[PDB]
């Protein structure tokens, strides 16, 4: 139930792309490849392992954008002495999540969303 070029897993379709794009550009590209297609979310070890195996087939350098922009959106900052948070001097440039496939392990880490990374798209069949 996936069109040509896409791999099926658990009612969803996936495709890894090698071209290096920044997160926004990659998310835009995914959106144009199929209805409902965006940068992949990852909801389980099994799904992660499936996506990692696609990357090892397509990419020589197996790192891919995931569909997470800004891990620190809507944080609830509190003081340990329970004083009210009014004075605030925390600003941070946008970071976006990269899934790094190593031959022994898979891990995620955050990179500046302006960096150029391969990526994987995903939509529901």
């Amino acid at each position: 139930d996936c069109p040509s070029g896409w791999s099926s897993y658990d009612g969803h379709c996936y495709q890894v792309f090698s071209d290096l794009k920044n997160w926004d550009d990659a998310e835009s590209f995914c959106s144009g490849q199929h209805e409902g297609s965006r940068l992949a979310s990852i909801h389980s070890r099994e799904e992660e392992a499936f996506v990692g195996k696609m990357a090892s087939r397509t990419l020589k350098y197996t790192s891919m954008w995931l569909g997470l922009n800004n891990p620190w959106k809507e944080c609830k900052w509190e003081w340990s002495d329970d004083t009210r948070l009014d004075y605030k001097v925390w600003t941070r440039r946008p970071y976006c999540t990269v899934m790094v496939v190593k031959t022994d392990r898979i891990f995620w880490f955050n990179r500046g969303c302006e960096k150029s990374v391969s990526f994987v798209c995903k939509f529901k069949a």
């Binding site: 070890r45 997470l68 609830k76 925390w90 941070r92 790094v100």
Partner: protein, 133 residues
Amino acid sequence: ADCPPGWSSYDLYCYQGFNGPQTWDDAERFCTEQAKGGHLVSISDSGEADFVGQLITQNISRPEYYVWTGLRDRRSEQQCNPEWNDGSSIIYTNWDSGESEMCQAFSRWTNFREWMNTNCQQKNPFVCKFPPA
């Protein structure tokens, strides 16, 4: 001022920087046991921020970028964003060690005047604060 020896006074409170290094939780626990009502330092205005900044520079010589503040997100999960791009809840995560950054620290490149979130399990110097009696 009636701040005990080793502590520095500023606007009805007592402060002291501690060359750690300690995790955020261990630093905070250390602060509560150093004096009654002690905690990791909190910042309420720019004056307190400037005092704590210079206090760190004059009493903490550490090669770290970070000195712990008392500010953090208290949740057990490793990030704040509740949803992926597609709207599905973020539940399963697989952060490499050091990538979950839910605790706030004073940053050296701002002369320890502004904050940056870093790994709560990273060991850093810290500053305690308690109200004298």
